[PDB]
């Protein structure tokens, strides 16, 4: 009976809750008590990457930590030389409504996606010398929210149709599709080991997936609104979630429960972009109040604010060496912090 | 200087890219972006055909003004969570079906189709982003609306309706209801038009609506209003 199945599901949820409570012998805040505080963390805008003429909905850092791609509503993908302000490429987009952008680890490809429901993979190292789209991945019934490159042939795409998928670039087909989120998926984070990847959706739940299996391993709850941003802890055994309820949450895959809630009374706007530092000591978050508050993961005490954007910080990325932070916002300007 | 020859050449390439970006931005400034929204049947196909996947963009020129429609009826997701991408569009071409006062949804037979239309209209008008993004209301399906209003009265959809079964009175009341749903009347405007399938005057009316959005945006930029 359907009622019997629902009762069994409720009993299983209660068992999961009981196990999670039994695992919570001590809180992370209590453990992080004798730790030396981070102090006042303050950076200035080292570089102001300007040239975008619309709101910047996405930005990714290359593996070299020098080339950065930015997606804006103007219909242009710009590859920036962060060291010396330069536009290596200005890729025109068929769909100006782009919400995600991804730089391949090898640096040869860049992806963009949005309301077109298509992940367009652009080839940069072409003999013709102009950026051309290698493949247009189609099959998602909802808007593209986040894409991340596993390699030159594999990409994982999160969409608003409550599904995520692993794509094969040369064939253009979905090798594996991930299903189980109730609401629209907005952000996905690839683990540093690349075996797993976690994604946050509108159902206030984050789910850790296996790219070679296709089944959800663990689901994490705790938020009261849509999870807008997600990023993996550099260890790869934890991750952080930004949601519209003005609080960040750091979950752990070895305990499947929340560890710390990064909330302040002053901030009421939600988090649009979440990114960790190199050591995980800094949980940089992009809020809708035209600010980017630098948090401390171990102690939920604010370390600093990245004021300087006239509009909402929509994207936030940290380099592979931890040298710089990009805070692309709706003010049509990207800023590099250090 | 302290710039190598390749560094200077890359800087010049960046300057050329900025020049092209500025040219494209100047071209896009003259462009006008319209968000085509609707509820129920919404008769939006008639407007798309007359006035000329997840998103469609029907581009058309009318009187030396490039127009860009964006129909998002196939999105089928939380409207709040991608409606922010359209903050800055010139206007919204909302499309209500004047002849859905008797038609009802397959599910939730208690709620009429046009009640859901007004619910979505109240959602989009009083949206947090589109406080000043004016709405070009399109009261389409007028012919069979008149046909139905010949037999069935408008009271079956609104018990508050006290007027003659004539087309003009019912149409005026529906327009008044939709305009009364505009809570913030001091910032944005509602432009109403009954779909005229003759000589393509709908494109013309959208042209005048867009011209006023442009003029009031110029005034706001100039501070006179």
């Amino acid at each position: 009976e359907l009622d019997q199945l629902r009762q069994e599901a409720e009993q299983l949820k209660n068992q999961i809750r009981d196990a999670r409570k039994a695992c919570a012998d001590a809180t992370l805040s209590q453990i992080t008590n004798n730790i030396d505080p981070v102090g006042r963390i303050q950076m200035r805008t080292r570089r102001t990457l300007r040239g975008h003429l619309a709101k910047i909905y996405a930005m990714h850092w290359g593996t070299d930590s020098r080339l950065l791609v930015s997606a804006s509503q103007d219909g242009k993908l710009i590859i920036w030389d962060s060291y010396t302000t330069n536009k290596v490429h200005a890729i025109p987009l068929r769909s100006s409504w782009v919400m995600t952008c991804a730089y391949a680890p090898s640096g040869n490809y860049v992806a963009c996606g949005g309301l077109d429901n298509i992940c367009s993979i652009y080839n940069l190292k072409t003999r013709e010398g102009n950026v051309r789209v290698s493949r247009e991945l189609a099959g998602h019934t909802g808007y593209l929210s986040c894409c991340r490159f596993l390699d030159d042939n594999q990409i994982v795409t999160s969409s608003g149709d409550t599904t995520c998928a692993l794509w094969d670039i040369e064939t253009g087909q979905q090798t594996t599709t991930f299903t189980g989120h109730t609401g629209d998926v907005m952000s996905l984070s690839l683990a540093p080991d690349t075996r797993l990847f976690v994604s946050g959706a509108c159902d206030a739940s984050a789910k850790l997936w296996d790219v070679r299996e296709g089944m959800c391993r663990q689901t994490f709850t705790g938020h009261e609104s849509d999870i807008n941003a997600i990023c993996f802890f550099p260890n790869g055994n934890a991750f952080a979630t930004g949601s519209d309820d003005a609080t960040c949450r750091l979950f752990d895959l070895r305990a499947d429960q929340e560890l710390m809630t990064y909330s302040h009374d002053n901030i009421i706007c939600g988090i649009t972009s979440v990114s960790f530092s190199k050591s995980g000591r800094l949980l940089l978050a992009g809020y809708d109040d035209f600010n980017c508050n630098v948090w401390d993961a171990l102690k939920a005490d604010r370390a600093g604010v990245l004021a300087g954007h006239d509009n909402r910080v929509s994207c936030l990325g940290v380099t592979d060496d931890g040298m710089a932070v990009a805070t692309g916002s709706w003010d049509s300007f990207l800023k590099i912090w250090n | 200087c302290t710039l190598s020859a390749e560094d200077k050449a890359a800087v010049e390439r960046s300057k050329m890219i900025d020049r092209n970006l500025r040219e494209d931005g100047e071209k896009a400034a003259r462009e006008v972006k319209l968000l085509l929204l609707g509820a129920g049947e919404s008769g939006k196909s008639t407007i798309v055909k007359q006035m000329k996947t997840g998103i469609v963009e029907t581009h058309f020129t009318f009187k030396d003004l490039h127009f860009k429609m964006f129909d998002v009826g196939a999105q089928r997701s939380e409207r709040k969570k991608w409606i922010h991408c359209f903050e800055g569009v010139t206007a919204i071409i909302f499309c209500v079906a004047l002849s859905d006062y008797d038609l009802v949804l397959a599910e939730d037979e208690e709620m009429n189709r046009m009640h859901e239309s007004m619910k979505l209209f109240d959602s989009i008008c009083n949206n947090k982003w589109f406080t000043d993004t004016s709405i070009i209301l399109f009261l389409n399906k007028k012919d069979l609306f008149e046909e139905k209003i010949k037999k069935s009265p408008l009271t079956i959809c609104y018990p508050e309706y006290a007027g003659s079964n004539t087309y003009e009175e019912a149409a005026a009341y529906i327009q008044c209801q939709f305009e009364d749903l505009n809570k913030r009347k001091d910032t944005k405007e509602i432009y109403t038009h009954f779909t005229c399938s003759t000589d393509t005057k709908n494109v013309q009316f959208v042209f005048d609506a867009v011209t006023d959005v442009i003029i009031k945006n110029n005034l706001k930029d100039c501070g006179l209003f």
Epitope: L67, R127, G129 | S4, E6, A9, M16
Partner: single-chain antibody, 232 residues
């Protein structure tokens, strides 16, 4: 990708000639364009360079004033208007493309060339190796020396390696003194210290027979070397 050229042939001294370069297979507007000439039995020499958008135009000392370089981006063609020709200008000229951005591969493609016959401060490079016989399966190191250090403050060395097979056009081997070009086998490798540079071939075959040239891009009066000939 092709960069064929036209014009050429016999010309009287003091006359004028125009050398064209038809470009196909690549977005010609995006690449800055070069002219490198090779005298009958001597090394390569840089003549003129025109940039993307023709904003930057440089000439060599010998061709200053006498020659003018121009490009027609809509026509995808490159021009070299040559006036007051002398017996020094007798050479088969090459049309060379070079795109310039972060991590680009300048001088990646070289045209076949057109033969011209005229009736009868800058950085220097020495390649004293001249002619050295090689055997298949062996390994060689080609030596190039620069008078001025090519290590710029940005961290990039600006030495390029080129290979000219007998009868064929030069082909890029190494750019930025370390980076391997596109399509060249991985056996070729490049290393240097700023003023002294070497190129290593792990294993040689019949396709490695030719003469090797080293170039700089630090200061735009570009100069080649004498050449390292590899016989069999």
């Amino acid at each position: 990708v092709q960069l064929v050229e036209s014009g050429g042939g016999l010309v009287q001294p003091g006359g004028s000639r125009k050398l064209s370069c038809s470009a196909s297979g690549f977005a010609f507007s995006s690449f800055g364009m070069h002219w490198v000439r090779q005298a009958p039995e001597k090394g390569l020499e840089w003549v003129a360079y025109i940039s993307s958008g023709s904003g930057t135009i440089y000439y060599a000392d010998t061709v200053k004033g006498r020659f003018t370089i121009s490009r027609d981006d809509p026509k995808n063609t490159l021009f070299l208007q040559m006036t007051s020709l002398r017996s020094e200008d007798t050479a088969m000229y090459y049309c060379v493309r070079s795109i310039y951005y972060y991590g680009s591969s300048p001088f990646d493609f070289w045209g076949q060339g057109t033969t011209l016959t005229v009736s009868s401060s800058d950085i220097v490079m020495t390649q004293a190796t001249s002619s050295v016989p090689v055997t298949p399966g062996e390994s060689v190191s080609i030596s190039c020396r620069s008078s001025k250090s090519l290590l710029h403050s940005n961290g990039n060395t600006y030495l390029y390696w080129f290979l000219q097979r007998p009868g064929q056009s030069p082909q890029l081997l190494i750019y930025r003194m370390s980076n391997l070009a596109s399509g060249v086998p991985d056996r070729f490798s490049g290393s240097g210290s700023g003023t002294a540079f070497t190129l290593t071939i792990s294993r040689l075959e019949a396709e490695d027979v030719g003469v090797y040239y080293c170039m700089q891009h630090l200061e735009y009066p570009l100069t080649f070397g004498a050449g390292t000939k590899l016989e069999l």
